[PDB]
Design an enzyme around this catalytic site. Sequence first.
Site, PDB file in Angstrom:
ATOM      1  N   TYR A  33       0.780  -1.342  -0.063  1.00 51.91           N
ATOM      2  CA  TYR A  33       0.042  -0.083  -0.052  1.00 51.91           C
ATOM      3  C   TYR A  33       0.941   1.310   0.052  1.00 51.91           C
ATOM      4  CZ  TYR A  33      -5.041  -0.679   0.078  1.00 51.91           C
ATOM      5  OH  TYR A  33      -6.380  -0.537  -0.579  1.00 51.91           O
ATOM      6  N   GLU A  78      -0.711   4.608  -0.852  1.00 50.65           N
ATOM      7  CA  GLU A  78      -1.238   5.974  -0.943  1.00 50.65           C
ATOM      8  C   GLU A  78      -0.485   7.155  -0.752  1.00 50.65           C
ATOM      9  OE1 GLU A  78      -4.356   4.283   1.882  1.00 50.65           O
ATOM     10  OE2 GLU A  78      -5.994   4.856   0.498  1.00 50.65           O
ATOM     11  N   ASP A 102      -6.027  13.823 -25.150  1.00 53.57           N
ATOM     12  CA  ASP A 102      -6.181  12.452 -24.875  1.00 53.57           C
ATOM     13  C   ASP A 102      -5.336  11.704 -26.053  1.00 53.57           C
ATOM     14  OD1 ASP A 102      -6.527   9.575 -24.329  1.00 53.57           O
ATOM     15  OD2 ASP A 102      -8.880   9.662 -24.022  1.00 53.57           O
ATOM     16  N   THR A 158      -3.101   6.222 -22.129  1.00 53.27           N
ATOM     17  CA  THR A 158      -2.774   5.013 -21.673  1.00 53.27           C
ATOM     18  C   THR A 158      -1.392   4.786 -21.611  1.00 53.27           C
ATOM     19  OG1 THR A 158      -3.378   4.300 -23.926  1.00 53.27           O
ATOM     20  CG2 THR A 158      -5.155   3.936 -22.306  1.00 53.27           C
ATOM     21  N   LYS A 171      -1.037   0.287 -25.653  1.00 54.83           N
ATOM     22  CA  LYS A 171      -1.234   0.658 -27.001  1.00 54.83           C
ATOM     23  C   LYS A 171       0.103   1.023 -27.673  1.00 54.83           C
ATOM     24  CE  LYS A 171      -6.111   2.151 -26.003  1.00 54.83           C
ATOM     25  NZ  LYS A 171      -7.043   3.150 -25.825  1.00 54.83           N
ATOM     26  N   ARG A 178      -0.821  -2.320 -19.095  1.00 58.80           N
ATOM     27  CA  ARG A 178      -2.251  -1.789 -19.009  1.00 58.80           C
ATOM     28  C   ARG A 178      -2.379  -0.694 -18.069  1.00 58.80           C
ATOM     29  NH1 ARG A 178      -6.543  -3.022 -22.497  1.00 58.80           N
ATOM     30  NH2 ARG A 178      -4.777  -4.594 -23.509  1.00 58.80           N
TER      31      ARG A 178
END
Lengths: 405, 405
Positions: free
Chosen positions: B51, B53, B197, B223, B226, B232
């Site tokens: 974790y 955060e 984008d 992304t 691609k 991903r």
Amino acid sequence: MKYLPQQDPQVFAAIEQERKRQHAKIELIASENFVSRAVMEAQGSVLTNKYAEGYPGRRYYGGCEYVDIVEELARERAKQLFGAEHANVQPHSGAQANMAVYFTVLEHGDTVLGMNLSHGGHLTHGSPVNFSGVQYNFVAYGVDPETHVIDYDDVREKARLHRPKLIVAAASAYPRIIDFAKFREIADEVGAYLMVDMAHIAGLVAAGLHPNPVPYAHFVTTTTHKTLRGPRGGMILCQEQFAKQIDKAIFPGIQGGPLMHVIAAKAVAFGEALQDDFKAYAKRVVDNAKRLASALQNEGFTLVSGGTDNHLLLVDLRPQQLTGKTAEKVLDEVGITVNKNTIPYDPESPGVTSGIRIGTAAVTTRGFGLEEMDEIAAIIGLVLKNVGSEQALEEARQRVAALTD
Amino acid sequence: MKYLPQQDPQVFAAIEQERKRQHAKIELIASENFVSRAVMEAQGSVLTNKYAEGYPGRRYYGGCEYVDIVEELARERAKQLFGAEHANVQPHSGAQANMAVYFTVLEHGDTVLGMNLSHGGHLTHGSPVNFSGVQYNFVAYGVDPETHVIDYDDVREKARLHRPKLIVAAASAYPRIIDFAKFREIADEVGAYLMVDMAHIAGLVAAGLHPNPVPYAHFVTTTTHKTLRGPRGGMILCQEQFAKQIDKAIFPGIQGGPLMHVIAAKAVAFGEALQDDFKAYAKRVVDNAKRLASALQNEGFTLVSGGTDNHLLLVDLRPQQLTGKTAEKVLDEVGITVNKNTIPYDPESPGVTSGIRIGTAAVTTRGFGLEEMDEIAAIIGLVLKNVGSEQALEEARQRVAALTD
Ligand SMILES: *Cc1c(COP(=O)(O)O)cnc(C)c1O
Ligand SMILES: *Cc1c(COP(=O)(O)O)cnc(C)c1O
């Protein structure tokens, strides 16, 4: 690893440090766990290469025959594990699982009733700096100031006064069993949906060591990581009647392409949780938490709610005149990982706190048992009672090393 | 793999089928690629256990020293790669990257101007079944009915009429270079933010083969998969002045814990993209796309916009009296993977379409060159001109097998 060391020495060196850190430290952060090699292998697979927007047998792209098998294995195993009528295994995280449920049943500005964030509620249960508190009108119920157990009459009163469209039950720092039947009764009285966010306790639910919210909640959200010991990600469970809407909320509602490799890892984790040895593991988690709680009380510590029914406990540090921040810092110096945590009715800010939160899922995975719980409590006692003694901290350091080898 | 085959034969068998499928088929879906073994190893690491955060040096939990190194490597490499002042490498996906930018600058119901979804705009650019179209008031600009190039006078007119708070440029099915300078000029005229984008074209931008939106856009989303050929996930780039707000939008705004193992994989991918051989790869992507476009035109196919400037092309199948759905289905029968795709001013529904979209990123990664492009076009010609001949389809099947080995 074979290819990463040669391709990217910098990234590899950092990963190796992290791997060694995970072994050396005593991990008591309640949300943490260690996944299996099988789970990691699944995430490190070629499934990352596949776009599979949509659902099994109902995909936008061709070539999904095999990732469909993977997703169905995840969904069917989840359903067997939790006795749910429908599973959506696509949420990228616990946050996105919640986001999707909110998107399904709420409109912008709708009232939602959740657990007071300072009493154990999660960031995604209405923080004013989170999408939940910005997008929806969150009101809160509390725990009793003495027993620190959820005040179900307060849940009821808040529900009746504010007339929420949705009631959220579940917590990131609540050490007792939650009564989902009472939550549903209250929800029914005011005509609200009930959502249970079981992220922290999902492994215990799977092992039959915490009551199952599935029969009582319209929607159950969860992380696949934490006590369930899966890969990092989310999941939604619900009855057949909400399946279509929930699926549409995840895609095309809030996400794009799912992480098929992580979904493979989810299937693996659910497979593991279905085994008898996971049930034994989860019992040791709870047994260890009780033992640790008892041993900490033996050291003279006060615990929120006076103990625990689950994997986690909260130390109220006010009797020692310590803040959570101070305790967190000094324990870090000796190799024990905890987090400062607000306690119910904390006189301190979230940045300082009067508590530390502790969970046993990670150390239990490492094979720690009751004897180790006693020693952990003793080390914490030694440290927090002697914050000004480098002698004591060095002794703690050596005792921590003795535990991790 | 070592542990997955023994732990979970079902999941392993399905992964193995998928792996073999990836090798056997000719992948022409424009969003698809094949990541390196190093990238996969990074995702399959123990970093899933942590974790983290918050942000590097500003985390909520202790023990983040090493994952901090990993995240900083990702951010710094992204900044060098794209010449951006700030990077956020935490978005779980392209969808979440966009979600975060929207959350940063827009209020519920604000007007946004994006590319017409039937002309190449993405689901997350205002679909009425996506959070974007539900949460915000999307209006659309179009391409010219003849040239199929974005009509910048239409962008301008729509911007001036509707007064959007945000203008979105970029596309999931636009085969020509986008003029970000003109988008920024229009944005400036109406006092709107510009978001680009670049998900589809990010690899080409990194290789200097498509103009960089970074100097022109307030926010750039993408992304990491691609054309960039990463794991991903998502990413946001922006100038220093928006860094704090963007970071807060991702966490605690829209997400919880980041996927540190995927972030490691992002760093690896960015490292790869910084190398000379990636630039050579990206040029072959674009060269192959032009060659394929030319060879398809030689077969008698009509292409949207009359060709391509990038990795992708769209076949307008109306002259052959075929729908995209029909073409997609029959090509699937011979081992060529495409997707049906709406063309500008398509007389057919999104479920049927008059086009197929094709991209060369995946086949280029496999080492396909100009000769292979000629053969691919010839096979597509053979198939689509002879949809009723099992003879022809079997020949196509054998020719596809000859290409993949
Ligand atoms: C951990 C947790 C979340 C969030 O999960 P992320 O994967 O960090 O987004 C949400 N709700 C509860 C109760 C949690 O414990
Ligand atoms: C692929 C894509 C997205 C979405 O990415 P996911 O990872 O599928 O959420 C968003 N915008 C554009 C332009 C894209 O191409």
